[PDB]
Amino acid sequence: PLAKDLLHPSPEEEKRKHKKKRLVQSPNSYFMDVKCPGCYKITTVFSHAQTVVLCVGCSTVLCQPTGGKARLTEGCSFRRKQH
C-alpha cells in the first residue's frame, strides 16, 4: 500500500492505534456517572480510578481499582458522559 491517506484515517484504524500514535492524541479513558442502589447522589468517577471512591451519604464501595479500569461494584448503573 503505497498510497495510504495518512491525513484522513477512518475512525477504525484511528481508534485501534495507540493513544500517542494517533494522528492527534486522544485519551482512551473517560468520565462516567455511577448510581449506587438506594442512593440519589450521582457520583462522577474516572473510568480508570486508582482509589476507592465512596458515597458521602452511605458507607459503601463503588469502584474497585484494578490494573487498567476501575471495576464497578455490582448493582451499580453507569452511563457515558458526552461520549
Next chain:
Amino acid sequence: TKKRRNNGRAKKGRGHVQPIRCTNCARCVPKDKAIKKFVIRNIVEAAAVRDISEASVFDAYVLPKLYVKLHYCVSCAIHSKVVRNRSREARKDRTPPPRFRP
C-alpha cells in the same frame, strides 16, 4: 565463518545455562546445547512379549514401559549416529525426523 545462527544452542535471552553431564561420556555440556532423546521402550523385547504374557499370573496385564531421558554431547551424538551432518541448506530445518509408522 558463523556456521549456525543460533551458535549450536537455544540460549537466546540468557547469560548462563546450568550444565548437564552427557549420559554416554559424562562430559559437562550446557543443557540447551545437549542433544535430548526421550526414549520410551517396552520393558520387555517385542520377541519376548508372548513368552511373558503366557508366563504371567494375570490374564490382561499391560507391560510397563521404560521412561528415560537421554542427554548426549554432540561428540557422542554424532558418534552414536543419532544425529547426522547435513547440507548447508538442510541445516536450516528443525523438523524432527518422521516416526515411520508403517
Next chain:
Amino acid sequence: MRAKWRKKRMRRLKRKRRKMRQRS
C-alpha cells in the same frame, strides 16, 4: 605452540626474570 601454552611459558619466564632481578 598453542597460544595458551605460549602465554603460560612466558609467565614462567617473567617470574624467573623477576627472581633474577630481585637477587641483585
Next chain:
Amino acid sequence: ISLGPQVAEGENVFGVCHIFASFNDTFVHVTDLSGKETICRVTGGMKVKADRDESSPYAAMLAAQDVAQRCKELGITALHIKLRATGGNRTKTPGPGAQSALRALARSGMKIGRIEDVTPIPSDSTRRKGGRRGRRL
C-alpha cells in the same frame, strides 16, 4: 518334604526377583516377598569364566535358568520382577542381560507377576566421575 510351604494346587506362592542388570555383570537375585530374606542369588559372572561375558545375555540366561531350578526345587512357583540398572549419578538403561534373564525365567516355566523398574533415580546426585571433559575415547 521338598523344603517347601504347605500350599494348595490351584493357587501359588510368590517370590520377589531383583534383576540388577548393569553393564559388566548381571544379577539374578531372588528374595522372599518382604525382600529381607533371600532364596538364591546367581550372577552372570559365576556362570562364565571369560570376564567379557559377565554382562552378556547368555550368562544372564544361564543364571536365570539356575535361579528358576533352585526356586522350583525349594517350592517357589511365581515371581515378581524389580528390574534395576546401575542408577545413581551413573546410567539408567538396564544392561544387556535383563532381557535374556527375564525371558529365561519365563521360558523355564516360572510364573510372572508385577514388573517394575526400581533403578535408583536421584532427585539430584553428587558430581559424576569423569571430569568436565568426560571420558575421552
Next chain:
Amino acid sequence: MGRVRTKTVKKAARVIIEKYYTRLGNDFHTNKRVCEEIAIIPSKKLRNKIAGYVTHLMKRIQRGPVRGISIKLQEEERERRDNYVPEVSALDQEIIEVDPDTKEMLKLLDFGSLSNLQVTQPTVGMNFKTPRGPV
C-alpha cells in the same frame, strides 16, 4: 539383471508406435516383421530388441494411456474434454447456502431479498486453526 533398454531402442519404439499404431499387433514375431520395411535397422539384435519393447509398450497402451501418443486415445480424450456438458447446470442450484455476513454484503451490493437464497445459521465456537506444535 542387465536388461535395461537404452534411449535408442525406446525412442525408436515410441516413434514407430506413434507412426504405425494401426499396423501393429500384440505378437512379438509379427512386430519384428514390420520393422524391416517401416525402417532401416543396421542390426538384427537391435531390430528384435525394438520389437520386444514395442510389444511391451503396446500391451501398456491397451492397458492404459502411455505418454507415447495414441491417435485413438487422443480422440477419446478430446471428446471427453470438449464435450459432455450435462443437461442441467451444476451452477443452477435452486437454493444456495449463504452466510448472514455475505447476505449483508449482498444487500450492501443491492442484491438483498432474492428468493433463491437461504440464510445459513452461522456456526458457533470459532474452533478453527490447528493445534500448534506436536501433541
Next chain:
Amino acid sequence: VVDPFSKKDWYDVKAPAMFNIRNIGKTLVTRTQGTKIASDGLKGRVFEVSLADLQNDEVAFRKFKLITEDVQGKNCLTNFHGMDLTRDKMCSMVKKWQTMIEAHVDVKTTDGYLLRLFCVGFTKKRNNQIRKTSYAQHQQVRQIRKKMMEIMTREVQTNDLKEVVNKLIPDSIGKDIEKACQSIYPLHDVFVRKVKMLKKPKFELGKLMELHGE
C-alpha cells in the same frame, strides 16, 4: 555343609481389615535357636505390595508398604506403613509443555501416627486449546499448592488412621483436590504420590487386634 533352608519355617502374612484380600503371601525365617528368637526375626519387615492384589478391581499403579510388627501362630500381623506410586506411572505422568505442582505437609492423626503426605498436580490443556503449552503462573501455582496443603490436613487431622487408609485407597483426597482447584486453574492428573510413616504410637496391642479382627 547342609543347606540352611532345611532350618527355615514358613509364615503367613495378613493384611489389615481395610483390605479384602487378607492373604498377602508367605515369608520364611530360620527356626529358633539359642537367643535368636524367630518372633523378633519376623518383626520389622516391610511387604512392598501392590493395590490390585490387596483390593479387588482398583488401580494397579498404587503401591503399599505394610510393615510387620507382631507375629502370633503362623501368621504375621501387618499395619499400614506407607503408600506410593509406581516408577512407571509417576514418570509417565510427567510431560512437557505443562507444569507440575507438588506439595508436602506433615500431619499427625488422632491416634498419634505422624504422616508426610506428598501430592502432585498437573496442568490440563483444554480440549479446544490451540496453544501448545498449558502453564500456570507462579501465583496460580502457589495458590494451588496452598489449597492442597490446606485440604490434605483436614482429611488426616480430624480422624483416625484406619479410615485414612481406606479413604486413600480410592484416592478421594486427590479427586477432591482436582475438584477444588478447577476454579483457579484446571488440573487433570492429581494423585497423592507418596506417604511415609514418621512416628508410631508405642504399638498398642488391642489396636492391632481390632485392626486385624473386629
Next chain:
RNA sequence: GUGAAAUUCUUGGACCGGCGCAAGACGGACCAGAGCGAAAGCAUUUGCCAAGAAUGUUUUCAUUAAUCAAGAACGAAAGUCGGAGGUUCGAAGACGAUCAGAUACCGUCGUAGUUCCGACCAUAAACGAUGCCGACCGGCGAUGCGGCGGCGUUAUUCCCAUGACCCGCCGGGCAGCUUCCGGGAAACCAAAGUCUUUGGGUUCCGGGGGGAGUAUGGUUGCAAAGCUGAAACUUAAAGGAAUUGACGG
C-alpha cells in the same frame, strides 16, 4: 572395572537383598530457541526484608536529558588469606594397563580444591566475536507480561465478576519464518540498512605480519598477577570470505 585386562575389595563374608543411623554435597524429570537481572548470573516448599520492568493513568514537576577523560560499585571459574565442614568428584601424587617410549588419553586410589562465613584478585571465546540514545524503513505466524474488546465452552451459584480455553487489538520484551528494502569481499545482516546521493548526538578503539602484550619505568596486589606499555631487529606477505580438486583413523 576394561576394547581386553590388571591395580583394587573378597569364607575374617566382598558384591547383592532388607531395616535403620549419620554426614556433606546437589536440587532430576516439569525445563522451553521460555522469564528475570547491568552483566557475571538466577530452578525444592514456606515466611520475611527491601528493590524493578512493562502495563494502566484527563496524577505531578517542567527540560530536570543522551553520551561520557578522571573516579566509583559489581564482576563466572580458577587462585590467595582466616575460621568451620569435608559426602561425592578430583589439579598435584601413587599404582595398574596401553605403547617402540607413555612423564598422557583408559582403570584404581588420592592431596589442594570443590561446600558455608569473612576478606582479597579483577581476569574469560566476560560472545551476539556486533557501544549507548533517537527517528525512519516490508510482510507473516507464534511466544512472555500488562491493558482493552468480543461468538461461544468450562469451574461454584441463582446470575454476573473471577479464573481456564477461543478470537482479535495495543504497548514493552525474547526470538523465529519470508523478502531483489537496502548493504556487504562474501558468509550473511530487517540491521551489519537508510554511506561518494558520503554530516542525528556521543564514548572507546585499529593502521601489514612478527618482535610483543615483551623490556624498562610508573602503579595496584599477601601472592599469583592486574593496569599502563616501547625500541632495536626481522619479514613480502601474514590474513578474511567463497569456488574447484585432493584427502579424512
